[PDB]
Amino acid sequence: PTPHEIRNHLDDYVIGQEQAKKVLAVAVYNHYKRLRNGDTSNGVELGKSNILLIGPTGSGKTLLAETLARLLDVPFTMADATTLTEAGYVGEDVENIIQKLLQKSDYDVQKAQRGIVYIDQIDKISRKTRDVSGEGVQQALLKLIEGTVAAVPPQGGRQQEFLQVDTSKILFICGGAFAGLDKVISHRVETGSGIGFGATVKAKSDKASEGELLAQVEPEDLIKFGLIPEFIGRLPVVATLNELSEEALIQILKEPKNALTKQYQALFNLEGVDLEFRDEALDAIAKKAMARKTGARGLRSIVEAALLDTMYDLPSMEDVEKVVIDESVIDGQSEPLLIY
């Protein structure tokens, strides 16, 4: 484990979040640094190092977790709380997550306790006949974080034997896009606005953007959202991710093997026709993508919206060996030029 090398590999699959990568390397290294030779210190109650990710949609949270699992040697799990029903109800229960962790570790208690845990869509469990997926999920999860030994039946139960696998040694990464978490932070940071000559007047949006607003967050702000303070108390670490960058959008379509440009290229290569995308068309697409405020996930809309006519007319057309996309094509005023 090297913070300089883990950051180099994540740079290959993730772009636009440099500060967040530094935070994960420190917290991840501190997690294992304690398990192998820790808890043999002069001072008692060494704080458990955890991670709390927070970012907008399409910010690559799932990708960061995925890239870590592949790199990392121990196993990794992706356990969302969308369907986590407490008290063993019909939907699901929190105990299954412990079970799925062992499947990845192949019933290795020594190897499973050193595992990592990640959860997505944690905003949905915010407290509001009965409530099943509400505040109840916080109570079950709270025991899992603070620290406690649970009972899981090995192989599901043939005897009534359970495995008392520790949980304080396992890491947890609670992360999910918090909707509405900007208005609450705005009230504290804004602190009103002056009316006189000397006092400065804020514009439509100068510091109210998503970027540079989450870094100054505090634990008390999350309490008003609905989360429990004890749950936030166990995660002193926080990771703020920027929405996006114009330059990163150009790189995502060229360097990654799964870029959208390469996808449509093979779609036409089978038909016996070539495809091309000039650099003047890539940067133009990035300006329209950021306006949608959806991220890389909403990037395919701009592409197919432009190549609709290009793809519909194409089959009827013959002798079109290659098609070139000019910057005007993205605007939609001028149709793409055909090469015969």
Next chain:
Amino acid sequence: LPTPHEIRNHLDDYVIGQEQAKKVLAVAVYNHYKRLRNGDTSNGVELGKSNILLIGPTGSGKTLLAETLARLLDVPFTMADATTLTEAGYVGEDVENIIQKLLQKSDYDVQKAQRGIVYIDQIDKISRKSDDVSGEGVQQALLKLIEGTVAAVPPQGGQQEFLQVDTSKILFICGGAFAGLDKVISHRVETGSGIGFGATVKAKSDKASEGELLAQVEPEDLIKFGLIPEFIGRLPVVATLNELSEEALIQILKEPKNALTKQYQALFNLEGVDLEFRDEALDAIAKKAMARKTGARGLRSIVEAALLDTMYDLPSMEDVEKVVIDESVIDGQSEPLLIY
């Protein structure tokens, strides 16, 4: 088994700058548990309970006193917030949820949860508005709860049955901060002033401590704040934190064994590297803490943000046995010195 002097030292180890508060909680918790051991075997029967009501500034360690107490006492503890609470049947919340929260610590308690402790935050938010589901109405529901009663509670959520648990035995600690209470008591006891020429101005915002005035607080002043006298009668014990001090913050990082300065020191001990924290660096943290009006709660943000670069590069770096931090580094204009 413990005594007020023994618990005072343990509390002192984790809390400082609050001497009167220690004696209040010590004798209160001491006599409270004495009643449980002896029960009602003596001539006296139905020994009344003594509740506790804390009033102090924000981030003054009110929650720490209740958390550290649960560790030494070993009894279950919960941290409930009254902001969400609503008046008997509205969208926000119902009082029933609080009862299950305490049981949730062990999830199985018949003769064990009666001896537990409960904490409440932001009690002033339910002050009786005099222009209601937020105001007075909420207080009326808690009267019977504190006085002692039994509520049906499904153990673990599930039987066709519910368990009865007494609450007279259960002690309650209503924590909170009463902002603006200085003006009410000042005109009543010390002097009517602040606006006139001869009248003393509020010059000593931070030069002098408002705490001394809070020591002369009485229940009659709380009535003007908005609380019901009947509600305050159930909480005869009163605890008053005075303030937080800049020099105390330096002691908070040195005297307590669980200080944040000591955690990083122990982190590098196993690594074979020395750590240092000069006095010239801690005083700067005090100024930044008071600047954000957050107290000790907004301390990790200043420390973790400063040591992000050093911690990330410490594993990569070799032949480094000591680290020195300076006041300039806290400001961000300098980089910490490294000794090989």
Next chain:
Amino acid sequence: XXXXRXXX
């Protein structure tokens, strides 16, 4: 199953 929670 279904919760009908409304407040005036």
